Amino acid sequence: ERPTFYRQELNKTIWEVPERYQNLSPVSVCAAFDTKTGLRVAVKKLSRPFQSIIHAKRTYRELRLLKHMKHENVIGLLDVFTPARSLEEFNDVYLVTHLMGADLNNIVKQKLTDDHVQFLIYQILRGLKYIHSADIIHRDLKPSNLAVNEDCELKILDFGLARATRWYRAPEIMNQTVDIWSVGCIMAELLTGRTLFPGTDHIDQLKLILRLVGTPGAELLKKISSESARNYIQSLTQMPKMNFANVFIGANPLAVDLLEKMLVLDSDKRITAAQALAHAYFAQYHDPDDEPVADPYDQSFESRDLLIDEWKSLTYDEVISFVPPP
Numbered sequence: 001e002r003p004t005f006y007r008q009e010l011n012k013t014i015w016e017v018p019e020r021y022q023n024l025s026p027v028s029v030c031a032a033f034d035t036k037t038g039l040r041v042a043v044k045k046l047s048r049p050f051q052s053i054i055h056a057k058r059t060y061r062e063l064r065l066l067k068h069m070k071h072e073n074v075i076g077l078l079d080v081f082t083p084a085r086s087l088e089e090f091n092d093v094y095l096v097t098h099l100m101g102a103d104l105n106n107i108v109k110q111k112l113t114d115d116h117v118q119f120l121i122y123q124i125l126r127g128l129k130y131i132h133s134a135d136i137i138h139r140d141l142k143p144s145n146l147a148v149n150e151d152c153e154l155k156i157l158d159f160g161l162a163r164a165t166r167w168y169r170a171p172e173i174m175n176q177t178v179d180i181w182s183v184g185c186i187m188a189e190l191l192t193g194r195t196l197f198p199g200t201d202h203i204d205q206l207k208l209i210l211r212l213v214g215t216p217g218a219e220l221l222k223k224i225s226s227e228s229a230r231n232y233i234q235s236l237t238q239m240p241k242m243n244f245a246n247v248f249i250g251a252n253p254l255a256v257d258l259l260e261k262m263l264v265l266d267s268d269k270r271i272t273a274a275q276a277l278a279h280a281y282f283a284q285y286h287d288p289d290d291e292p293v294a295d296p297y298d299q300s301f302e303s304r305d306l307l308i309d310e311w312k313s314l315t316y317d318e319v320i321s322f323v324p325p326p
């Protein structure tokens with residue numbers, strides 16, 4: 001059943017993919033045209049998957065996450081292959097998914113309207129609800145990993161991997177509700193057309209957040225876990241909480257209300273993804289019978305810290321067991 005593979009040097013690196021995929025353009029990920037289906041697909045060649053214990057762990061995980069995620073707003077695994085004829089020769093991993101048109105970055109890079117924002121944000125939260133129900137958090141949600149086609153059909157890209165960029169990072173990590181932070185941060189940029197928090201360093205970044213959220217309450221200040229973090233909030237002046245109505249001039253009262261529940265430092269009281277889907281701003285789009293949860297994701301492998309070869313062998317095994325989706 002093994003097909004013929006073919007080689008090419010793209011941007012200083014060799015791609016050994018099957019015959020089925022032609023015209024590879026670097027979009028490292030490639031925009032390849034698929035001959036069997038005749039569609040445009042994205043092919044990802046993994047960067048030194050087994051050239052460290054961490055790269056290897058990262059490698060297995062990503063494949064485990066992909067062989068699992070089946071949601072219309074969560075990029076799915078179409079194909080997984082290796083030039084490898086054997087486990088002993090297994091050094092390269094490739095993952096195949098549908099190609100998208102644009103990331104939410106270039107979309108605004110021209111400001112977005114209300115129904116446009118409602119449908120982009122509804123979907124972002126719809127995908128999380130699934131990622132979240134499989135006991136997974138994205139941790140690095142940003143415009144560059146939310147992808148859409150012409151039809152505004154949205155996909156959550158690069159979840160559960162990664163661990164200028166701080167822009168969308170929840171302050172308690174600078175629980176699942178860390179991506180809700182990123183959501184509200186993305187929702188703001190779509191409504192205005194500006195980065196809400198374009199901070200230059202980890203100190204600046206917090207000062208901007210606090211300059212809008214307000215300095216934490218004496219209740220929240222007692223709650224905080226870091227001595228250095230608490231002692232840094234004290235070191236800073238007392239900012240009040242800014243009226244979002246005055247910051248987001250002209251928005252749907254429910255959009256501004258929505259962000260109030262998205263930009264809250266109390267990580268225990270912040271809006272969850274599922275909660276946000278039921279909020280008044282989404283009513284036209286909201287469907288409780290069409291907002292699914294994920295089939296339990298067995299992630300016991302996470303508590304295990306093996307050697308390169310034990311991971312590689314596991315990454316090899318999962319490439320074998322694959323049944324492509326129809």
Ligand SMILES: CNC(=O)c1ccc(C)c(Nc2ncnc3c2cnn3-c2ccccc2)c1
Nearest residue numbers: 042043044095097099100101102103157158159
């Ligand atoms: C946890 N691993 C992933 O999420 C993962 C793993 C493997 C692949 C191949 C992908 N897929 C993509 N990676 C990067 N850019 C992508 C896609 C798909 N479309 N676009 C895109 C196309 C045009 C414009 C902007 C973006 C994701």
